[PDB]
Write a protein that binds this ligand. Structure first.
Ligand SMILES: *[C@@H]1O[C@H](CO)[C@@H](O)[C@H](O)[C@H]1NC(C)=O
Lengths: 107, 504, 132, 75, 51
């Protein structure tokens, strides 16, 4: 009922590249989607609320978009502090689920 | 198109000047609107959908019992404690039992013990709730003329095409201009609230079988309650009617579970309407509504089009509908281009005397291709007919003879209107919709009168309303002073006509 | 400063019950829905449940129905999570977080959210291991 | 566990066919007819009862309906 | 324009994004059409007070 696929499974890129992650859910989640990135052994990193909104303190290096059922996050320029597992998760209907993850690696 | 062979269809016109065609949209039939201009239009309610449902109390009808317990106590030492009873996962009832000699308890007489056991259960009844918002109407409509064999079969490209359109309606966004490139704008604004009298309706899913229930009935069912609950061991409420306690003549009380009452709730479900694909998207069958429809902007696309003089040929034996009209699919090659084509009927030619109901106005052909099939319809008068198609000498004609008399037309129309009068109640008004004075008068008089009919004769059953009408008749003959005995006759006839409902 | 703190990592018996504490700082304790979310070491995050610091209201998912209990402690501004009947999947790290417009006692998500939907005080993560 | 509310008492007078009307608009008739076929002498019981009430030769049959229609269901 | 207008002269403060503009009105006893924005790119809505 809250099945949300988060593509791809993993990625690896050089510094200064743009990267984009997709998440489509089987349901209508009009704007109740959010995005994190977490290191191993970390509390995750402030990325995105409402799938379109930058939080205070977050670098403008990140952006989020998407309206109906599928949503795109994007790093404008890759940086060493961007190594983490990125997560997208919905907010509605309350079997709250997350994505399994999108993992990064610097070259 | 799309509304032929779907009997319970209707045709409504609008006295031209100020497009004001408020139709009673039907999720169990079609409605075709015509106008002297403004290519004739149909509307058919495909599905009804509900997005978000809330998880109100659930029910369990399949329970299981185990680890029973009795806890006997002497005739006078208080009455049984049974620390088991301490937990609520166990259901317990306390019973006075006989306690004699050779039974312990140096005294004897009526003692007491508390029989009970664990209440484990399965097959929950998810009785969710829905509200008049974030529900969703979805209709499709179709203008006539082109599109041989309209025929929902390949609807996918037909909403991308010009002859058909698909419309979603929300109580948030009621308006929708069904726009048809080259045809028009089809202004629509509906009442997404007063369709099914929601907010008193619950979506029950028991065995992955869904339906809608008048929430009053759902509140009144005496099974164990989840009662609002979420995860955590379900603390069932009232916990008693399901299990049944039973002692011997005087002693040794045990418990039975009464199994599952799945079919029992089925036979108790004798008024609900079933519902399907549910997901987070719960679909359901028929439910009506009120849709103000405006011909603001509908261009007929080819009033200037020529009448290309190819010979036209029938293909299928133009049988008629219950509404008296008759549809024909006429194929022809021989000419090309976006053709206008003639289609009239007569009783004699060397006149061609164009007579009768022309439904499919401005029949249009698309292209140079071979014998394009040109589906359309017309409606003949009460007598013999001569449907004429092509142009002149290399035309094609055909007998009809409707065989439906003019007074017969009034018969069918009034019995149809009466069935509307019944099932739609107030909403049966403004069906033929002009904002006339007596129209709002009928709306209002039915409003107050039928609302009182509801609140007074609350949900009168089949048999109930039957006998009520009968005795009201018997009294309508008896009393003096016709003033009130005529009112008896009136209410009795109303009841009996209500018993002449769709059920037949 | 708005910030949450968990108890230390813990190891328990299979079938036992573990209670992790979550203490708040920097805000009025009765204004933020506490969400608990699990994370197996190699797995992603899966929301466990929610409690309201006020009135001790509770809810969770079916993956924990019958084992999870969540209680309040208004005095020290804390919330206590018990997992019962521990199981080999329970070896994970659990997170507690403050959330949104905690007006009365619920999840309350049809109204708005965000602005650290639940992400300002994600604390430190409570590592729990279940074995002998 | 009396599943009390026979929902027909809350009918939806709506165009699509309701849940089980097919057997419903005969079930109460088969009810009363089965019950009386099983308890015949109750016929003349009700007769002697009603013939003693109303005293109209027209309300008499009404009380006959009264008795023969309390007997089946509420029993 | 019909019905009870309670929140007279509804005022918006600043250039900022989708300011939330809370207010209320009261409809007549029948169906309603609450209209907000201005003209064509306005927003309307059914009510029907039902009182
Ligand atoms: C079948 O689909 C085609 C488009 O591929 C369309 O032109 C045609 O009208 C459709 N026929 C029916 C009966 O839906």
């Amino acid at each position: 009922d809250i099945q949300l696929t988060q593509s791809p499974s993993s990625l690896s890129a050089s510094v200064g590249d743009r990267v984009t992650f997709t998440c489509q859910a089987s349901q209508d989640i009009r704007k109740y989607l959010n995005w994190y990135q977490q290191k191993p052994g970390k509390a995750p990193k402030l990325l995105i609320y409402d799938a379109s909104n930058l939080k205070t303190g977050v670098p403008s290096r990140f952006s989020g978009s998407g309206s109906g059922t599928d949503f795109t996050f994007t790093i404008s320029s890759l940086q060493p502090e961007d190594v983490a597992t990125y997560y997208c998760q919905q907010f509605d209907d309350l079997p709250i689920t997350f994505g399994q993850g999108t993992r990064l690696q610097i070259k | 198109i799309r509304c032929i062979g779907v009997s319970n269809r209707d045709f409504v016109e609008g006295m031209s000047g100020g497009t004001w065609v408020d139709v009673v949209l039907e999720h169990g039939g079609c409605v075709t609107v015509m106008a002297q201009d403004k290519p004739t239009v149909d509307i058919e309610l495909v599905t009804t959908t509900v997005s978000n449902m809330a998880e109100v109390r659930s029910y369990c009808y399949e329970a299981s019992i185990s680890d029973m317990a009795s806890d006997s106590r002497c005739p006078t030492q208080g009455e049984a404690y049974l620390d088991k009873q301490s937990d609520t996962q166990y259901v317990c009832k306390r019973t006075l039992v006989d306690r004699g000699w050779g039974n312990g308890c140096g005294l004897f007489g009526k003692g007491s013990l508390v029989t009970c056991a664990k209440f484990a259960c399965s097959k929950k009844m998810t009785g969710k709730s829905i509200q008049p918002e974030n529900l969703e109407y979805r209709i499709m409509l179709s203008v006539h003329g082109s599109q041989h064999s309209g025929m929902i079969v390949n609807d996918t490209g037909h909403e991308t095409d010009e002859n058909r359109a698909k419309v979603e309606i929300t109580p948030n966004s009621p308006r929708a201009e069904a726009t048809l490139g080259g045809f028009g704008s089809l202004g629509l604004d509906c009442e997404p609230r007063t369709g099914l009298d929601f907010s008193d309706l619950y979506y029950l899913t028991m065995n992955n079988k869904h339906w809608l229930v008048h929430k009053e009935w759902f509140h009144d069912i005496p099974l164990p309650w989840h009662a609002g609950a979420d995860t955590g061991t379900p603390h069932w409420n009232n916990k008693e009617a399901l299990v049944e306690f039973k002692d011997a003549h005087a002693k040794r009380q045990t418990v039975v579970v009464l199994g599952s009452q799945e079919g029992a709730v089925h036979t108790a479900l004798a008024g609900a309407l079933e519902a399907e694909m549910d997901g987070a998207k719960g679909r359901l069958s028929s439910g009506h509504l009120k849709c103000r429809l405006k011909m603001d902007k509908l261009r007929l696309k080819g009033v200037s089009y020529s009448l290309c003089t190819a010979a036209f040929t029938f293909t299928k034996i133009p049988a008629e509908t219950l509404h008296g009209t008759v549809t024909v699919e006429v194929q022809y090659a021989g000419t090309d281009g976006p053709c206008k084509v003639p289609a009239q009927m007569a009783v004699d030619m060397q006149t061609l005397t164009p007579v009768g109901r022309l439904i499919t106005a401005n029949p249009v052909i698309t292209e140079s291709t071979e014998n394009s099939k040109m589906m359309l319809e017309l409606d003949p008068p009460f007598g013999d007919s001569y449907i004429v198609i092509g142009v002149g000498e290399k035309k094609i004609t055909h007998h009809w003879h409707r065989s439906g008399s003019t007074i017969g037309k009034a018969f069918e129309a009034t019995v149809r209107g009466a069935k509307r009068m019944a099932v739609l109640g107030d909403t049966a008004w403004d069906f033929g919709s002009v904002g006339g004075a007596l129209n709002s008068l009928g709306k209002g008089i039915h409003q107050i009168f039928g609302a009182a009919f509801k609140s007074l004769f609350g949900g009168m059953s089949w048999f109930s309303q039957i006998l009520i009408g009968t005795l009201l008749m018997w009294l309508g003959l008896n009393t003096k002073n016709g003033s009130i005995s005529l009112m008896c006759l009136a209410l009795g006839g109303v009841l009996i006509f209500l018993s002449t409902a769709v059920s037949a | 400063e708005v910030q949450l703190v968990q108890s230390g990592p813990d190891v328990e018996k299979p079938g036992a019950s573990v209670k992790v504490s979550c203490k708040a700082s920097g805000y009025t304790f009765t204004s933020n829905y506490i969400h608990w979310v699990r994370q197996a070491p190699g797995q992603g995050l899966e929301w466990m449940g929610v409690i309201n610091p006020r009135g001790g209201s509770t809810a969770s998912a079916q993956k924990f129905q019958g084992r999870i209990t969540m209680t309040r402690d208004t005095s020290t501004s804390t919330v206590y999570m018990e997992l019962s009947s521990l199981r080999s999947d329970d070896t994970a790290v659990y997170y507690c977080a403050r959330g949104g417009r905690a007006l009365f006692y619920d999840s309350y998500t049809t109204p708005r959210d965000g602005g650290s939907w639940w992400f300002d005080p994600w604390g430190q993560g409570s590592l729990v291991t279940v074995s002998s | 566990a009396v599943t009390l509310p026979s929902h027909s008492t809350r009918k939806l007078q709506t165009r699509s066919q309701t849940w089980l009307e097919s057997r419903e608009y005969t079930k109460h008739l088969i009810r009363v007819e089965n019950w009386i076929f099983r308890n015949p002498g109750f016929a003349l019981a009700a007769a002697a009862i009603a013939w003693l009430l109303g005293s109209s030769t027209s309300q008499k049959v009404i009380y006959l309906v009264m008795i023969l229609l309390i007997a089946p269901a509420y029993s």
